[PDB]
Design a protein around this ligand. Structure first.
Ligand SMILES: [Fe+3]
Ligand SMILES: [Zn+2]
Ligand SMILES: [Zn+2]
Ligand SMILES: [Zn+2]
Lengths: 63, 447, 1182
């Protein structure tokens, strides 16, 4: 369920700021709340679902 | 000085005034001759400044010679000696000096002058008790006068009389005329201005054509053969800063064309004499030979018009008419107190009894460089006409009649700034046999 | 006050130098060779001391100092007046004396003791009675000529003080008749018509309203010889026109009514209701379409500056027309007070009509301004002779491509400060888009998105820079350099586009073209042309497609090439093709979406609105606001000479000739009868104009003469006899008409100072002072040897234009860091130690930067002073200067022509321009601003040695422009009101820029931008001032104007009209008519009128005759008589007028006037001197 919460947080971050967001900012903001492996897992599940897409490497935006 | 956008105006191109069949003109032969005209004289033939100075010197020497010749005609003048020869004669012998006037000073016991002739300069003292003290009180500078008195070795000429070149007290009566002929004098039309009276001028043109209300006026119109204009026929351009906003026709060619269109309704049997003025397209200084032909052509082609100079002398049935624009009246008023505008006859009397149209130099009348002086009244006339004052008046002095034609322009702002109240639309009527004004017409009610 | 350590040390060092000068000055004067035995320039340190030493009464300084801190300097004047009336400062005598003293002291306190109004402007104070009305007493104030240069604010305060004094003395009001009011109404209009154009011309109703209520009379003595219609008015002694009184009435109470109302309200004066009442009675659509309309309605074009055009002074921009001067808000290092800042490239491309220090007649903010080079701002855009378009932002590029310039599409930028808008109460104009706005948007976007805090123009922390660089994937060094200097460091186009896409900010202002200068239909046609007939090369940058090159044929483009020129797009013409280069192809094709969406014109929309409606990257307007200007009064830097040059103040009469040469009179051995004072030796009885006896060596005593009996009395007897002759009972005089032998005096002086090789020595025809004391001839000999000149008081002066400066670099003024450390400078403006010549150092209040010409003249003056000290006084030398660089660290005195108080400065460097650089506080202390004013500098020791009160003219105005008291400390609280509006912030905030679009008055933004006024009282008003725009060099650009190399009028007019033709925002046809109506026709007509009413002159003598002599020669001399107004004067301007009429399209009125003038000039001279042309065609058409 922690993965689902992480996915919800990742979705919340991108909605508030309607622009492309770097990966480093997401990693820092999520930070101690979830370890890096879970962050990457959430990112790959979101890209598999198709909610978000990456224009460039290291940059993600809402889709 | 800012000039705005163009405007559309009229040139009086559709004005036609006909002749009444009731008035049948009387058949009178015409006797008009131009006795004097500036363009009739021929002037006799190197740094520019030297030639200009010589021209001015010759001008003043010619004035002195002519006015001396006029003075010597008085029988009471005798034993005239030159100023440079004053030391030869004794200190108790009566002598008479003739010369120009340089400076006049009023002291507590008399008048002190500085009189200059071609040979020297002397200082004169006129005692207060002298009978001819008021005449010396009004003499303008640059006028030729005479003094009669003794000379002291101290260097002062103590005079007891003062003379001026005047009009003789007696003149022979001219022979009569078989038929009666009238003449009309007008001036200062100022065509092209905002204050120009149009309806008054149209009513005037309808008066010359036989539309009259009274039988006596019907008698007068049938006997009119001459019309004379003296100066300011058009308003001009560039006279003073702020004139474009005060113009209806702001172009010189169309101004003269409009004047020609208005004047074409003058009846055929009437002959017109037109002369230049201050505002017209002519010479900046007086005397003025004529209008510029290339600018004032439309008034040259009228079949009953004669262009004359400023000044000129016209002989009508044996009677001499002196016609000048009359800018020298302003210099008299400034000098002598008690003579103001609205009574321009008295300054005219002063100018006539000095026998010079514009004596003072460096005042407010410009004098052109010329080897000979042409503003001297060489022969006593029968009638003198002037303008430039915009107020009507007429006086008689020793058999001559002096008339100041009025204006056709209403009160401008510049006049109400300096407090001059003009009299518009007044026309003198003169009789050739007597050279006197018999009636004054009033068209001022219309505009 | 408790100042920091640096400021107190600086002031103490200045005081030590002043004391060092004063010691030598005191030693020299005590020998007895001079008019007095003590130095005649006292020193004061505040307003109270100056007031005590200028107008008195004695003992007032302590009371002023006590009362100022308690009430606030406006109630203090009233308290001082009350105390003086009560007699606390002694018994003055009659009531008139009390009134005069009180009025002078109060006006001096309110004016701060600098302006010479209380000394010379006010002549008398008298009591008079209303004989016609009620026989009641009233107070009257008499004014002199000097009141005309005392300023508007000093004139009204005089009326206020007079009213208060008359109220305190228990007097009554002034009750005028109708004749008085009518005479005043006539007099004001007559003065305006005849002698001088008043700046503010009141209506007759306003004049009557003022005359009906002012409780005190405003009269004076006659200044001009012009008569008036209303004459013999009771209570007025002169029939001639009075100038000072009417200028006071027109300019103090009426023009400056609001300031007087404010003073009345703050002080508490009652009875001034009418002035307050008079003051209060006196006062479906696109975004940019609406903004333009509202701007046009609320702010209207002003054409007052362009009314008059003078030949040789060009017009650079039409009123509020695109293509003129762009408006940029800011303040440079060397501008801000009233000074504009322009790029030096603009100066070159206008044919150097503009040089550093040239005055400009400006439209919007104020009336006048001075130019100063700024390199950071943009420059002109030009079109070459082969069709290419270039951008010129460098001095070298302008120097290189000047000869190939065909059209100036845009002039450039102007830097105008916010303080000027506050001072002139000018409504804010919409701001153009610039780099400082963009950087603020950049940092705000970073803060909102990534929560990283950065500050422009400063040094940010390293970790924040690294974090931002990681987020944005750019080089941290580049980001640091861009944030530190956003004006000079700009990103490439691909970074600008990436920033716009990622961060959401608009496009960089550098890459934005003038899109709103073309109608949407032109862009619509250009879109199809580019889509069909253009070949474009593309490139990719991080997934963003941008153009690289555009090539299109000229024949297919057609008339769309003008759209590119109006857009300001650089391009070249080659082989019949138009090529657009790298950075500008992207600038043109990116705001259009790379031709993906079609551009269609629609009503009630602008180009930028259509772009922003359907494009991802937004833009902002770059050319919304424009300002026009005109040239006047070129820069000045030159020494001062009296109208005939004078080297010694010694009377010679006509014995020396026109040049008044004492040496020439000495060679011929002439005897001159002049009016001079002598002295008598107590022991041997020698009588001579010198002070020390040539035989004994003892000081002599002045001789007083009786005008009737001609008796000589020494000083002791004259003092004992109370300066009255016992026999005649008449007042004695110190001077008499006497005969002297110049040869003996000159030989004795030459033997005295061992100077023999002098060829010329010029004096004066007659002394003006009442004492008529002559200056020693040895001083004149030394001045002639060193080639220097003397003023009326006895000093040597240098006059130059004044410009402001606050920060400087050592390399600009040619001074090493070691010399600066010796001068007291230790840190730069950011707080770091001074180690390099490229750093920026703040300028101390009383340090000045001179010019090369000033140094060259002051070196001669220093040599003269050293020679004087060594030979005349027998004292060691002081300056010991061999080059102008040896004057660094020495002291001068600044003085203004309309004041009588000086301020001490110190030299620290030199520049090549013809200006005088100083702190704004320094110029404010002389009551001047930097909009074309000229001030004077003189060496301190020379003034101390040579200045004497005995040399001053007797008539009113002789104490004006003289160092009666100098000031040794500078206090910003008591300098001037204008400097308090100056802004001292480093950068303007976003609120200002966003508030510009709402067209707000500047008073609503005073709390946002810090100004000098907010620091008054605190120790922070002496240091910490800052600037917005930097500059590479303050003396870069042309030095001398082109107006000084042109002699003939025709050449002037030709160059002026060429400049008018080149500039796109100037109508040359309109300029052609302005010259004819303002400079040429008036002169022609005036000369033609004056020719026939002139005077005549002789060549040997100078006699004037009102009519030519008959014989053609001078009656006395026999010499030649010559004209005064010649034919050359009439015809000097005819050819130029004919050229203007024949070439340019002017109105018919002017053509006919010029043709008639030609005909009149030709016709006037007919008797004396017996083809496709404009006149012939004009007269042949009709
Ligand atoms: Fe007239
Ligand atoms: Zn002695
Ligand atoms: Zn005496
Ligand atoms: Zn002479």
């Amino acid at each position: 369920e922690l993965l689902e919460k992480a996915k919800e947080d990742i979705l919340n971050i991108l909605r508030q700021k309607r622009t492309a967001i770097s990966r480093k900012y997401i990693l820092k903001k999520l930070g101690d709340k979830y370890d890096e492996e879970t962050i990457d897992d959430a990112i790959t599940e979101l890209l598999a679902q198709g909610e978000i897409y990456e224009p460039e490497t290291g940059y993600y935006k809402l889709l | 000085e800012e000039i705005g956008e163009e405007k559309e105006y009229s040139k009086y191109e559709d004005v036609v005034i006909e002749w009444n069949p009731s008035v049948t003109p009387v058949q009178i032969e015409k006797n008009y001759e131009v006795k004097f005209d500036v363009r009739q004289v021929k002037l006799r033939p190197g740094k520019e400044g030297e030639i200009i100075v010589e021209a001015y010197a010759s001008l003043f020497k010619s004035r002195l010679s002519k006015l001396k010749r006029i003075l010597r005609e008085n029988p009471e003048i005798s034993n005239v000696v030159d100023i440079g020869k004053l030391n030869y004669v004794s200190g108790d012998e009566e002598v008479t000096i003739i010369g120009l006037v340089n400076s006049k000073r009023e002291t507590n016991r008399g008048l002190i002058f500085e009189v200059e002739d071609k040979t020297g300069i002397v200082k004169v003292f006129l005692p207060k008790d002298s009978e001819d003290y008021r005449e010396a009180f009004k003499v303008l500078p640059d006028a030729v006068v005479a003094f009669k008195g003794f000379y002291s070795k101290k260097g002062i000429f103590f005079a007891n009389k003062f003379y001026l070149p005047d009009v003789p007290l007696y003149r022979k009566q001219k022979p009569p005329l078989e038929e009666k002929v009238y003449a009309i004098l007008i001036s200062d039309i100022h065509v092209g201005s905002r204050e120009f009276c149009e309806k008054a001028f149209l009513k005037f043109l309808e008066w010359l054509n036989g539309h009259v209300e009274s039988k006596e006026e019907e008698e007068i119109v049938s006997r009119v053969k001459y019309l004379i204009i003296a100066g300011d026929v058009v308003d001009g351009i560039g006279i003073y800063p702020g004139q474009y906003s005060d113009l209806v026709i702001p172009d010189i060619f169309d101004q003269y064309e409009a004047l020609a269109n208005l004047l074409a309704n003058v009846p055929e049997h009437i002959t017109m004499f037109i002369g230049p003025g201050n505002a017209d397209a002519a010479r900046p200084a007086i005397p003025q030979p004529e209008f510029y032909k290339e600018y004032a052509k439309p008034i040259y082609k009228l079949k009953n018009a004669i262009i004359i100079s400023n000044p000129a002398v016209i002989r009508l049935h044996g009677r001499d008419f002196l016609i000048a624009h009359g800018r020298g009246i302003e210099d008299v008023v400034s000098f002598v107190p008690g003579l103001t505008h609205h009574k321009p006859g008295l300054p005219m009397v002063e100018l006539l009894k000095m026998r010079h149209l514009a004596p003072t130099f460096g005042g407010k009348v410009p004098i052109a460089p010329d080897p000979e002086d042409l503003l001297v009244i060489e022969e006593v006339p029968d009638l003198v006409q002037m303008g430039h004052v915009h107020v009507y008046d007429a006086v008689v002095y020793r058999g001559v009649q002096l008339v100041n034609s009025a204006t056709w322009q209403a009160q401008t702002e510049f006049q109400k700034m300096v407090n001059i109240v003009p009299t518009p639309a007044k026309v003198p009527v003169v009789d050739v046999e007597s050279a006197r004004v018999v009636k004054v017409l009033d068209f001022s009610g219309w505009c | 006050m408790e100042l920091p350590k640096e400021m107190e040390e600086y002031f103490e060092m200045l005081q030590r130098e002043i004391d060092k000068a004063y010691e030598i000055a005191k030693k020299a004067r005590a020998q007895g060779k001079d008019p007095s035995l003590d130095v005649e320039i006292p020193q004061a340190t505040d307003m109270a001391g100056r007031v005590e030493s200028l107008v008195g009464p004695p003992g007032v300084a302590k009371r002023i100092r006590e009362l100022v801190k308690e009430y606030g300097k406006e109630i203090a004047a009233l308290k001082i007046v009350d105390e003086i009336i009560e007699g606390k400062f002694g018994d003055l005598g009659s009531r008139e004396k009390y009134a005069e003293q009180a009025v002078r002291t109060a006006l001096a306190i309110l004016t701060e003791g600098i302006v010479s109004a209380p000394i010379e402007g006010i002549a008398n104070v008298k009591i008079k009675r209303n004989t016609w009305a009620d026989n009641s007493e009233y107070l009257a104030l008499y004014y002199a000529g000097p009141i005309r240069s005392s300023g508007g604010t000093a004139q009204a305060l005089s009326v206020l003080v007079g009213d208060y004094v008359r109220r305190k003395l228990g007097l009554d009001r002034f009750k005028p008749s109708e004749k008085h009011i009518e005479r005043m109404v006539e007099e004001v209009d007559l003065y305006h018509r005849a002698v001088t154009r008043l700046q503010y011309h009141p209506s007759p109703e306003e004049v009557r309203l003022a005359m009906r209520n002012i409780p005190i009379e405003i009269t004076g003595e006659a200044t001009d010889d012009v008569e008036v219609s209303h004459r013999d008015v009771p209570g007025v002694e002169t029939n001639q026109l009075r100038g000072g009184a009417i200028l006071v009435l027109a300019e103090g109470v009426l023009q400056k009514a609001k300031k007087l109302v404010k003073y009345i309200d703050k002080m508490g004066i009652e009875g001034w209701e009418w002035l307050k009442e008079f003051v209060e009675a006196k006062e479906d659509m696109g975004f940019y379409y609406s903004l333009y309309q509202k701007f046009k309605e609320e702010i209207a074009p002003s054409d007052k500056y362009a009314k008059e055009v003078i030949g040789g002074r060009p017009l650079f921009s039409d009123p509020s027309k695109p293509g003129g001067f762009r408006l940029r808000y800011g303040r440079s290092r060397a501008s801000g007070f009233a000074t504009w800042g322009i790029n030096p490239a603009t100066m070159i491309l206008v044919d150097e009509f503009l040089a550093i220090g040239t005055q400009l007649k400006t439209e919007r903010p104020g009336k006048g301004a001075v130019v100063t080079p700024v390199t950071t701002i943009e420059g002109p855009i030009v079109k070459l002779k082969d069709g290419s378009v270039l951008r010129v932002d460098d001095y070298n590029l302008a120097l290189k491509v000047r000869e190939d310039v065909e059209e100036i599409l845009y002039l450039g930028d102007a830097v105008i400060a916010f303080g000027d808008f506050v001072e002139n109460n000018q409504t804010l104009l919409p701001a153009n888009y610039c780099e400082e706005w963009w950087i603020l948007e950049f940092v705000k976007a970073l803060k909102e998105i990534y929560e990283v805090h950065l500050e422009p123009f400063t040094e940010n922390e390293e970790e924040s820079i690294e974090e931002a660089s990681d987020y944005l994937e750019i080089d941290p060094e580049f980001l640091k350099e861009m944030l530190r200097d956003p004006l000079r460091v700009k990103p490439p186009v691909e970074l600008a586009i990436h920033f716009s896409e990622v961060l959401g900010i608009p496009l960089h202002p550098y890459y934005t073209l003038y899109w709103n200068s073309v109608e949407p239909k032109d862009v619509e046609k250009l879109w199809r042309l580019l889509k069909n007939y253009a070949e474009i090369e593309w490139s990719n940058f991080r997934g963003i497609k941008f153009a690289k090159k555009i090539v299109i044929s000229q024949e297919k483009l057609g008339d769309s090439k003008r759209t590119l020129e109006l857009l300001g797009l650089p391009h070249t013409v080659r082989d019949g093709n138009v090529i657009v280069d790298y950075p500008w192809a992207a600038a043109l094709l990116t705001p259009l979406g790379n031709l993906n969406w079609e551009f269609m014109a629609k009503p009630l929309y602008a180009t930028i609105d259509i772009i922003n409606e359907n494009n991802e990257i937004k833009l902002r307007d770059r050319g919304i606001s424009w300002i026009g200007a005109r040239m006047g009064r070129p820069e000045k830097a030159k020494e001062r000479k009296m109208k005939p040059p004078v080297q010694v103040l010694f009377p010679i009469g006509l014995a020396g000739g026109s040049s008044r040469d004492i040496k020439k009179a000495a060679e011929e051995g002439k005897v001159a009868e002049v009016e001079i004072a002598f002295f008598k030796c107590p022991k041997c009885g020698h009588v001579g104009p010198e002070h020390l006896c040539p035989n004994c060596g003892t000081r002599k005593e002045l001789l007083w003469v009786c005008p009737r009996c001609n008796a000589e009395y020494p000083e002791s007897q004259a003092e004992g006899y109370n300066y009255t002759c016992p026999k005649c009972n008449v007042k004695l005089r110190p001077y008499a008409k006497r005969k002297i032998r110049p040869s003996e005096l000159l030989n004795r002086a030459m033997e005295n100072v061992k100077v023999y090789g002098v060829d010329k020595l010029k004096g004066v025809m007659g002394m003006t002072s009442g004492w008529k004391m002559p200056e020693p001839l040895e001083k004149g000999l030394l001045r002639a040897k060193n080639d220097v000149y003397v003023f009326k008081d006895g000093t040597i002066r240098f006059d130059a234009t004044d410009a402001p400066i606050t920060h400087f670099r050592p390399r600009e003024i040619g001074v090493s860091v070691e010399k600066l450390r010796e001068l007291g400078y230790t840190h730069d403006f950011e707080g770091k130690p001074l180690v390099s010549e490229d750093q920026i150092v703040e300028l101390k209040p009383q340090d000045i930067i001179l010019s090369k010409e000033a140094g060259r003249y002051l070196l001669k003056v220093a040599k003269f002073v050293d020679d004087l000290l060594e030979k005349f006084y027998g004292l060691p030398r002081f300056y010991n200067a061999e080059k102008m660089e040896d004057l660094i660290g020495h002291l001068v005195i600044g003085l203004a022509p309309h004041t009588s108080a000086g301020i001490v400065g110190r030299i620290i460097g030199f520049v090549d321009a013809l200006v005088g650089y100083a702190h704004p506080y320094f110029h404010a202390a002389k009551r001047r601003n930097c909009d074309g004013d000229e001030d004077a500098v003189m060496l301190l020791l020379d003034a101390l040695l040579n200045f004497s009160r005995y040399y001053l003219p007797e008539k009113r105005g002789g104490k004006m422009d003289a160092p009666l008291v100098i000031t040794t400390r500078l206090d910003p609280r008591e300098v001037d009101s204008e400097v308090h509006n100056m802004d001292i912030v480093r950068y303007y905030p976003l609120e200002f820029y966003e508030a510009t679009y709402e067209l707000k008055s500047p008073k609503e933004l005073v709390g946002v931008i810090e100004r000098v006024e907010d620091r008054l009282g605190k120790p922070e008003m002496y240091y910490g001032l800052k600037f917005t725009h930097d500059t590479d060099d303050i003396a870069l650009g042309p030095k001398m104007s082109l107006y000084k190399q042109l002699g003939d009028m025709e050449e002037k007019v030709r160059r002026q009209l060429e400049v008018a033709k080149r500039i796109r925002a100037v109508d040359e046809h309109g300029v052609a008519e302005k010259i004819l109506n303002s400079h040429l026709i008036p002169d022609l007509r005036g000369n033609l009128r004056s020719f026939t009413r002139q005077e005549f002159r002789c060549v040997k003598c100078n006699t004037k005759f009102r009519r030519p002599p008959l014989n053609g020669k001078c009656p006395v001399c026999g010499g030649k008589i010559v004209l005064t107004v010649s034919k050359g004067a009439i015809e000097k301007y005819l050819g130029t007028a004919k050229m203007l009429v024949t070439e340019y399209n002017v109105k018919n009125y002017t053509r006919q006037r010029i043709c008639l003038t030609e005909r009149d000039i030709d016709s006037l001279f007919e008797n004396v001197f017996p083809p496709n042309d404009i006149c012939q065609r004009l007269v042949m058409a009709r």
